[PDB]
């Protein structure tokens, strides 16, 4: 008892929660391809080929979504990368001039390979021949170009149009040599901190976790951007998870995460031709010259029966949080373009796919089976070139035209939902959900939901029986 003396330690395994700053760590093989990517640029430190998944079993830590500080740092990182990736590129300020458009006349093919039989792209583009100066500022020349209708608005005086963006900002066009390929990114903490990963399978969004696993840093994170549906995400292993801080509250979104994937198949079957027209001293502009050959609206193909199965599963899962209600889906109820659409960027081109017929259903009691046979679901999708991925924090951007044929497949993981309010007796035991919505952060909170940065405090201290010797 009387021989209890302080005994300082060093290297004790004790952590306390805090917030730090991370850094990129790209994959070794996925890097050094002379691609000049936007997100995972050449400045990332090479990753560790042998990450350690050290299993701290016998313990408990309180995780939390909707407050994980890591989302803010990487969101700011994505914004900064997107902003600096446009600084070297050229502006488009000489283009804000009145246009003299005309609806399209051309000697194009008529066979059209009409298997989709949905519709050719008449009235979807406008032949607009504007008039801007050449290198010498004293001379102007007439140049014609093809623009989509989403990039063009009319102020007054019909038969005279203008660019849409010219009353809010100026949109620098993308440099043609940089691509938007989503490279996996491994966020790694500086030495001295650590990242805790909750290894539970059926992990609900918040609350304590009792199977914590520690790693030096996280795995690859896809920087893909989307609006209404998650793309190329990481599927959960246990079962379908419904994530929400307050399901009762309807002021926010609801993240739905699947454990069975669904493949999307969307492509643009028509060629555009790339023709370059100078605008001034050392400044060049890439325009869609004249479409030739195949003419069809870009469409997406999705296995219908897989969609029916996934809808049945998610309805079954939501059947426990709303024990007696009736669940049905409806298309987006309005607003700005992204929410009322499906937005995803592929191969340097932005897509706005309607995807209305994917959310027209009513499930009552699972009494009768929706027995139908395999018919693929085809949905239209416009194409937009003057993009504004963020409201006012990002820089408005103009993707250059891409020639040839665009064909990429995505393979879907997550769905964004939103509850709808109602009364007590007015409701007919029914709750309706509408997809769409959600900011960019809502995409990332579906992936960084397992990690929490911690700081090490190796200064332990505890009584013992020592007594440091005296020097005579």
């Amino acid at each position: 008892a009387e021989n209890l003396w302080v005994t300082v330690y060093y290297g004790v395994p004790v952590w306390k929660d805090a917030d730090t700053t991370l850094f990129c760590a790209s994959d070794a093989k996925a890097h050094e391809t002379e691609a000049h990517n936007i997100w995972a640029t050449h400045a990332c430190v090479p990753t560790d080929p042998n990450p350690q998944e050290i299993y701290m079993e016998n313990v408990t830590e309180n995780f939390n979504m909707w407050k994980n500080n890591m989302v803010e740092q990487m969101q700011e990182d994505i914004i900064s990368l997107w902003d600096q990736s446009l600084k070297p590129c050229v502006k488009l300020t000489p283009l804000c001039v009145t246009l003299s458009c005309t609806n399209v006349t051309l000697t194009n093919v008529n066979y059209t390979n009409n298997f989709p039989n949905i519709g050719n792209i008449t009235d979807e583009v406008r032949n607009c021949s504007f008039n801007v100066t050449t290198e010498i500022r004293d001379k102007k020349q007439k140049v014609y170009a093809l623009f989509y209708k989403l990039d063009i608005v009319q102020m007054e005086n019909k038969n005279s149009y203008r660019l849409i963006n010219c009353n809010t900002s100026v949109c620098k066009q993308a440099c043609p040599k940089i691509s938007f390929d989503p490279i996996p990114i491994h966020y790694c903490t500086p030495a001295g901190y650590a990242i805790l990963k909750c290894n539970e399978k059926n992990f609900n969004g918040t609350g304590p976790c009792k199977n914590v696993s520690s790693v030096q840093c996280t795995h690859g994170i896809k920087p893909v951007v989307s609006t209404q549906l998650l793309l190329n995400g990481s599927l959960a292993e246990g079962e379908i998870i419904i994530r929400s801080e307050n399901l009762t509250n309807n002021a926010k979104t609801i993240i739905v995460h699947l454990n069975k994937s669904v493949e999307i198949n969307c492509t643009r079957p028509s060629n555009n031709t790339r023709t370059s027209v100078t605008i001034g001293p050392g400044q060049v502009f890439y325009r869609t010259g004249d479409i030739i050959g195949d003419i069809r609206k870009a469409y997406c193909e999705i296995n219908g029966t897989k969609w029916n199965e996934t809808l049945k599963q998610v309805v079954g899962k939501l059947k426990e949080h709303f024990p007696n209600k009736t669940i049905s889906f409806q298309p987006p109820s309005g607003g700005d373009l992204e929410i009322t659409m499906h937005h995803f960027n592929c191969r340097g081109e932005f897509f706005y796919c309607n995807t209305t017929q994917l959310f027209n259903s009513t499930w009552i009691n699972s009494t009768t089976i929706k027995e139908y046979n395999d018919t693929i679901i085809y949905l239209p999708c416009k194409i937009k070139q003057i993009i504004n991925m963020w409201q006012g924090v990002g820089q408005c951007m103009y993707a250059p035209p891409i020639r040839g044929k665009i064909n990429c497949v995505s393979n879907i993981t997550g769905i964004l939902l939103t509850r709808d309010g109602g009364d007590a007796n007015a409701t007919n035991d029914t709750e309706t959900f509408r997809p769409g919505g959600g900011n960019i952060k809502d995409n990332w909170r579906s992936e960084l939901y397992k990690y929490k940065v911690v700081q090490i405090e190796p200064l332990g201290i505890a009584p013992t029986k020592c007594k440091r010797r005296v020097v005579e």
């Binding site: 003396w5 302080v6 060093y10 430190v45 299993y55």
Partner: protein, 136 residues
């Protein structure tokens, strides 16, 4: 044999023989590499966070050294000075602490008497050393 941070949930007594694993990874990580391959990569927003990452590594490790330096237990892993422990911070016996209560809980249990103790150690070291000069 354990891994890094691999016994935090274990009892304190059985977790007192794996400290070298944690103490061996305070600086040795991945930040030491400059870049994958060298137009002024030192100003890219990705490249401006290593500076925040690198200086945070040392500035977090030095704080450990400063406290170890003054207490006289510098250059050791498990040291022990000769300042009494009057039990007002924790009056539990020898066995009630070491064998059963885990490390994380113990650190939280006295987290409000630390600042008083951290000042006691240095003063105990200093006045003890004053005896040495006043001894020869």
């Amino acid at each position: 044999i354990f891994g890094f941070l691999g016994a935090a949930g274990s009892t304190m007594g059985a977790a007192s023989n794996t400290l070298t694993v944690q103490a061996r990874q305070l600086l040795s990580g991945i930040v030491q590499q400059q870049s994958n391959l060298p137009h002024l990569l030192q100003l890219t927003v990705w490249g401006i966070k290593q500076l925040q990452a690198r200086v945070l590594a040392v500035e977090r490790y030095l704080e450990v050294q400063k406290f170890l330096g003054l207490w006289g237990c510098s250059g050791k892993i498990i040291c022990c000075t000769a300042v009494p422990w009057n039990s007002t911070w924790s009056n539990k016996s020898f066995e009630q602490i070491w064998n059963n209560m885990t490390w994380i809980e113990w650190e939280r249990e006295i987290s409000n008497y630390t600042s008083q103790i951290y000042d006691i150690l240095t003063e105990s070291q200093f006045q003890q050393d004053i005896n040495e000069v006043d001894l020869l």
